[PDB]
Symmetry: D2
Subunit: 410 residues, 4 copies
Amino acid sequence: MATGRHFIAVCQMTSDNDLEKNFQAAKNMIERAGEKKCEMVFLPECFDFIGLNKNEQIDLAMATDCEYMEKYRELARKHNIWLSLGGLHHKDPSDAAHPWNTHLIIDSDGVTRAEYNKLHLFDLEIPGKVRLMESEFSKAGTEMIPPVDTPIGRLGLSICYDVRFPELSLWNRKRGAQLLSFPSAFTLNTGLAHWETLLRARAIENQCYVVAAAQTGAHNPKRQSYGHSMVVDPWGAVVAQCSERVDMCFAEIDLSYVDTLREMQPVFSHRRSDLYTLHINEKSSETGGLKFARFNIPADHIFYSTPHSFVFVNLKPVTDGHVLVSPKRVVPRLTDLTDAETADLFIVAKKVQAMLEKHHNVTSTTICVQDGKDAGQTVPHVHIHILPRRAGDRSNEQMAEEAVVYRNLM
Amino acid sequence: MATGRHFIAVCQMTSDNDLEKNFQAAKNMIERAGEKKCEMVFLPECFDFIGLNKNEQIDLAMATDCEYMEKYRELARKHNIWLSLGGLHHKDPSDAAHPWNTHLIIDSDGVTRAEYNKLHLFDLEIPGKVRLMESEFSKAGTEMIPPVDTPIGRLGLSICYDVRFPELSLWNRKRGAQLLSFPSAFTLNTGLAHWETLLRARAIENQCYVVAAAQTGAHNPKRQSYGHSMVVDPWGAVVAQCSERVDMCFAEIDLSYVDTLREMQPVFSHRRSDLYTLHINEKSSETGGLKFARFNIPADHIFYSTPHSFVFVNLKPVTDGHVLVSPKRVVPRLTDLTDAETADLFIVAKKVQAMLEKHHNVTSTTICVQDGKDAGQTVPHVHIHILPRRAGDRSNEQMAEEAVVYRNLM
Amino acid sequence: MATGRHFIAVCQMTSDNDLEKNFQAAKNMIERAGEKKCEMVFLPECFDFIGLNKNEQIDLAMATDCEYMEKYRELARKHNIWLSLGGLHHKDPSDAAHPWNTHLIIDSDGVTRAEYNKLHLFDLEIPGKVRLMESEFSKAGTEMIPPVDTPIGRLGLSICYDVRFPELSLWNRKRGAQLLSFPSAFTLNTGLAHWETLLRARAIENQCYVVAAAQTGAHNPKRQSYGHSMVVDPWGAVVAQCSERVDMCFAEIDLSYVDTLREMQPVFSHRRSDLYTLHINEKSSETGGLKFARFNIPADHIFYSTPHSFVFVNLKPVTDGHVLVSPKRVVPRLTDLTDAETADLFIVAKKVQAMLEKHHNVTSTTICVQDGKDAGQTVPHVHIHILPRRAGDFPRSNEQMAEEAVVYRNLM
Amino acid sequence: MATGRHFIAVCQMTSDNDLEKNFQAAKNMIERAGEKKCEMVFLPECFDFIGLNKNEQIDLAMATDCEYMEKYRELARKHNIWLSLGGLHHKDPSDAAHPWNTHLIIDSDGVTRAEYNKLHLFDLEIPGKVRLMESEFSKAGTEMIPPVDTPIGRLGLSICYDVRFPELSLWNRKRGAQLLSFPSAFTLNTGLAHWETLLRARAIENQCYVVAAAQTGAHNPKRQSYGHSMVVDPWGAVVAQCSERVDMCFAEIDLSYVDTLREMQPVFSHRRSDLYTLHINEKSSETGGLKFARFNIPADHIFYSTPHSFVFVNLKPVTDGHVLVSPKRVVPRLTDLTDAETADLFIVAKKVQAMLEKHHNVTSTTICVQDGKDAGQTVPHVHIHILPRRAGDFPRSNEQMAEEAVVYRNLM
Ligand code: EMC
Ligand code: EMC
Ligand code: EMC
Ligand code: EMC
Ligand code: EMC
Ligand code: EMC
Ligand code: EMC
Ligand code: EMC
Ligand code: EMC
Ligand code: EMC
Ligand code: NA
Ligand code: NA
Ligand code: NA
Ligand code: NA
Ligand code: NA
Ligand code: NA
Ligand code: NA
Ligand code: NA
């Protein structure tokens, strides 16, 4: 994976409702980024456009794989450079009334390597005073995207308002991010007070470079952005920033500096996990079985998994729907688990419970945990018995037949 | 509770190992704070002293209620002013080798209204390079203290390094804090890069005033502090700061400004709780029973409680140790609970499990949850059956007799 | 004179065309300042009002002068506090279109203690896309006003745009200022970029506190201000700043601190007076006196003087108008003068020449300086002879001399 | 001349007394700059070394000049890049204790393009508790060095402490600078408070990019530097800054941007030249020419000139040494001159007077100016007569005049 020094360029622009003009601006900077042999170029949120009306910023929503986007993918190839499209107006075939705010990272091939959907939207609705609903022009993302590996390092993905919620960034760092990102279209009055401080703060708390390509100037009579597109190092210093205008800045991030800081200031090893736990709901994929004590549970027997736990079908179902929920960390007692695990184990149990009832169509479930010899534990590895109930109350090939049905319901 | 405008003074000093000199400096500023009719004065971490050796910063550790401290309590009375003693070297009768870093808030009567023990310590130990262990000169605090009500508003308590962990502050705001605090003795090189940014960041993310009284200058040949004691408003502006020297600054915080901002920018109503949850382990006191569906469980029947859940002794114990764990929020199904609740419910179940086994001296427990008619739920309110096991397997006056024994073990 | 600690209050506001609303905003803050026993409060630049157009600002100037000006003097007296009125629209009796932008300092008794007229105005005339003319709603000052002594120290005076010019502030510091002031109404876009840096820079490079009450928010549909009213110390630290709204902030200034810095960082003792000189046109006021060699020139005979020079009538003039320009420092050679003194001495000669030619109605003048025994110098003190000339051309009573001096004095 | 965008690199380092280590640090960065095709790199103030004592700094100055100076010129040529050596210990052949602090600009061919000697040194002598004397390890410059043209623009030159003095920077901007430079080694405690604000302020008030490579970290047990090497744009934005360590940062500067700002914010067209004047002693270099009324004074006869004035020998001198001082702008009256011109004209007269008296060995001088027909003025162009005087006292060949001018020219 990425290591050492890497040269990158951050783009600042003032997008119109004139998609061609907007494109030309960007293309011009990307070309210059290539000329300087940058490995990656970052563009701001709303890089595609910023319409006058909303029947406009919903009518122009693209497909991520459209003819406009191809112009970008074509550029990435042409200049052998990765791209960070800060926040595309992602049209949703089903709900055209609510596009997505998608941050895309593209290959030197033009191949999308990652997509992140703005998770936090601004919704203010004060009875008879003011009503500004971002959730009216767009739609929030539904899941947590982990950082992506790039030639310049582990890049955490976020967008604008996201910067305001520390939990999201702490998580990305925990998932091994080296650089955080916050392409944005900040307000002049908000940005002039919170932009630099919030970005520098994120970089310092997570000890990561922060790359924030932004919108600046007036997009139209009723909209102006703060600008100040910058790059912050893992120590909180602003090592690169654009001048007040449509232009770019350059930075040479050094992944080694990140390592040095994390080593000399092990903050993430100082967190009192015995007092607080930042739980995140993440859905991971198991391209290989998992250890249930000494036994090996086949990936085809697992229908849901997260970085802390997994759910697998039983070899001796005490009743239809009877599955198991155990922590990836091989541990026998519940009292041996850490809050992160305890919390994730039962929140997963909750997600699984609801699904088993929608399927086996019932309205009752029993959660049992045999922790100890005297309690009936037949295997030294914590497992939650989740068994749906009704009125009454194994084929290795048929066990994966069950696991498949559930996997599509999780 | 506190409302409106309130005038406060922040003290900056460079403490010696000369407790009398240090005292005089502080007393002088407190007197001036009184003269200006301030309602509260904040002093920095290590306000009592900063010794040359460690056999010194462990020998001088006080009692919180000693003759030195009385000088302060006497001052609070004399000038009718609340005090924030940023970080006293709190001697522990049992472990004299590890004092506490205690932030105290004192009455206009000299009455302690709150104590907070530094939760985060700096411990760096790189094999053959450098070894700086804060946990060698002192001892971390063991529990989470909630904000205290003061005449100037809901004051969240923290100390120095704490500022580096966002979770702690998000929690304090959630517990209704209006002002956060971070009295400190920051390093010149660290502070010159992270002080203002981290404080301004906390104020902005939690929309609270931030009061940080600090140490400055050189305490001795081998120790210098950053200083820059300040006050930040809920918008991130530094409204007051001390000059580079032993002196104070004044600020008039306006709790209404806090309300305005929180209303016009409802960030804490934008957090995706469906994706992440900041769980905190807090121990609350129930000076009154709780609703277990429609029934009323007596406080004397409850041995442990938190802002999300409670544990009470059963009216029909299926076996010794058989207790119940339910969420304060009256809900029937597990799938009706929020991650905060799910997580806290079972982490409490974990804490309770371990205690029941240390007492009933056994090594097995069963966790059951009858969620639904068909599962055997006899009451429409989620409750976890926690029943310790062995080989074999109600007096209202004797039920509180059990609850009392456990309460002292929780 | 003032020394020690002093408590002050800085006010921020959003002035519009509602004199009563602006006044009530200012009054509220002055009252709170008085309640906290502040010795002085600072109001921002257009504290009186910001009109929607030229004609309205003319009407408002009259309505302000007529009703509110005195109301502030009353507040000053009632709350026993000094006021710094950051820059009112001072209506000019003979030019209603161009009032001055006056910074007024009012004492505890409501008495004007000093008046600064904004010297720097922003004039942008781009035939193509722009025309922003501040001199179309105003008129720049005419004199350099030295710092005023106040209960909080030597206060230098200026108004926003003045910050961009270092010359102005360096001067005030040299003239004894311990605090500089920059009451103002900055544009949101320009303030958002230069406000803090400039105010802090002036503080640091001049080693003075900087007090800058400012306008903030939306005044009208097409006028916005940055805000961020603050107080910066002599080391450049922002010790107090208003929150984003119509409100105030408090700061205790310490003149001791200024002194301490001036001593551990004697920056002003390090200037290369030999390479560069900052000359300033300043007319001095004097009880009298002044030596010319061992001679005592009575004030009656001195009609113009600056911190560096003085001009006086001649007992034995070689011709009508023959006056003398001399440095206050008593030295004989022109080569004894410092660049600062040489610049002033001849720039003053330039002013006297013009004054004399207009008065005596001549069009020629001879400037002569005899430096040395062999050049005919009669007294060991540099003096420039300024001789008006006529086509004819080549002991006087005290009464004649005093009169001639009175005449010239009122033409300078 | 240079226009458009230009890529540059700024270097930060922790120089000590190990010339080889410091050089390898600098070399590494210059190579990386070359690899990125930068047109110019900036090294900090004491890039050569920081010694543990007076004697070591003298030894190191020799060892530097002997081996490393040329090595940098080689790097310049090899990597086809221009160098800005922030302030080497320039050993003075006749005073080993007081070298100059020279800022050198080396071009692509390793040729010195310009040399600035630090004009401002920090001297603190408090009989009581302190004695910090920079002039004890150095010697201040002697001349004002105007900006140098480079592939990246008009570069003004300075070294750290110079930032505190606005005069120096205002001048460079007036002399055409598009970028100001402040290579340096700031104290950790002073930089931590004034570094960013001052650099940014100079940028804003002069509308120039500011390039400041700096020392950082611990040099030795009792010497620390702030660091934070950066590049500020004409609007005051910090566009590039090194991380906390021995490393570099990159910035693309745009001369177009400077221009644009200079036009939408014509700050320098707004200065009150009528109230204050910033005079600077500068000796001009000239191909020749210069008119005196309708007369063409050949360079052969001009022995001293500044941006505002020139002095020349006389065809019909009334006495040995009779020369003339005149403003370059052709105007007849002394009252036609601007304060800037009046200050310069007589400060130059002051210098010529001294030069002539020492040369002709006299002790008296008569300075005379005839302004107007009736004052005897013969040509309609201001000219000051400078007449050396003797006890005796009161057409010349081109050869005599040219010679006399050569003599005087080498004494100014
Ligand atoms: C909704 C993408 Hg700007
Ligand atoms: C709509 C927040 Hg960039
Ligand atoms: C351990 C209190 Hg400074
Ligand atoms: C020891 C951290 Hg203030
Ligand atoms: C022109 C006075 Hg605000
Ligand atoms: C003096 C009454 Hg307008
Ligand atoms: C001329 C800006 Hg208040
Ligand atoms: C005195 C040159 Hg660093
Ligand atoms: C020029 C050899 Hg030291
Ligand atoms: C004289 C400070 Hg580099
Ligand atoms: Na499209
Ligand atoms: Na004690
Ligand atoms: Na000033
Ligand atoms: Na102060
Ligand atoms: Na004469
Ligand atoms: Na300069
Ligand atoms: Na630029
Ligand atoms: Na003559």
